[PDB]
């Protein structure tokens, strides 16, 4: 029994902290503000059953932003391949990646 007294009386007791895309002090954006905004605007009013399957690309992008599991997997694959290449001497890291060139300001 979700007695939604907040929506009835118009009070805002806890809906201000339910999402990171809501208003935050000094307009400090969330790390995944864009993805959550897209997911919420996609899945607004169509119901939970439709939102699960229809706005699934947006939710997948949001999850990837939140956890970076696939990005970390790609980076780990790159690191492993680079280590394997270095072991066999098939690759030489560039000087800007070896701390030899001054990074741009």
């Amino acid at each position: 029994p979700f007695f939604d007294v907040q929506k009835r009386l118009g009070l805002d007791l806890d809906r201000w902290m339910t999402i990171q895309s809501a208003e935050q002090p000094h307009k400090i954006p969330g790390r995944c503000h864009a993805f959550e905004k897209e997911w919420i605007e996609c899945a607004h009013g169509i119901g939970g059953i439709r939102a699960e399957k229809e706005c699934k690309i947006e939710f997948d992008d949001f999850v990837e932003c939140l956890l970076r599991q696939k990005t970390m997997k790609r980076l780990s694959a790159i690191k492993r391949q680079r280590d394997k290449l270095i072991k066999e001497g098939k690759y030489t890291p560039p000087p800007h990646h070896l701390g030899k060139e001054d990074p741009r300001p």
């Binding site: 007791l13 935050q24 997997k73 780990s76 690191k79």
Partner: protein, 173 residues
């Protein structure tokens, strides 16, 4: 030094094993002390200066009252340490072995899935490249408790007052 957070988390697990094996509550106290301090270190490393110092301060004060009681209620003529009972030592060793096995499995095998999927790369990767400017974002979000979280303040204050009342009612006979 690129894995400071991982080392601190391992010490966190070690302390949790230490006070989970149930030695004398006095020794469980220092186990929780170490765990809280190392957790404060982790939170500091992730940018939560106020939050980490807050857990450190509160638990430091809380475990003191526990110590007072350990010497008043849970006082055994021969208080037991992690190497005093084969049950306590067995629990401690089992916890350490579990932690070491999971750490080894996570490290040598980059992608590890025990219950969730854990990646073996360093924790530095997940950090963001943004600039907070003239802000302590954690501090501002926490201070928003009195402006945004009026309802939270009300409920927490009421719960604390009712907690005082409940303590007095319980400890009255």
């Amino acid at each position: 030094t690129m894995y400071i957070a991982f080392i601190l988390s391992t010490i966190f697990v070690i302390g949790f094993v230490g006070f989970s094996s149930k030695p004398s509550p006095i020794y469980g106290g220092l186990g929780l002390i170490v765990s809280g301090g190392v957790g404060c270190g982790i939170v500091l490393n992730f940018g939560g200066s106020f939050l980490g110092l807050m857990v450190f301060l509160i638990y430091l004060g809380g475990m003191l009252v526990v110590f007072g009681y350990t010497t008043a209620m849970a006082t055994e003529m021969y208080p037991e340490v992690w190497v005093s009972n084969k049950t306590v030592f067995g629990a401690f060793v089992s916890g350490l072995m579990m932690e070491f096995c999971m750490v080894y499995y996570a490290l040598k095998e980059e992608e590890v899935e025990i219950i969730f999927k854990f990646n073996g790369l360093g924790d530095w990767v997940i950090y963001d490249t943004g600039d907070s400017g003239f802000f302590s974002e954690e501090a501002m979000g926490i201070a928003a408790l009195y402006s945004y979280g009026t309802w939270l303040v009300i409920v927490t204050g009421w719960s604390l007052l009712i907690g005082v009342v409940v303590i007095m009612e319980i400890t009255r006979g």
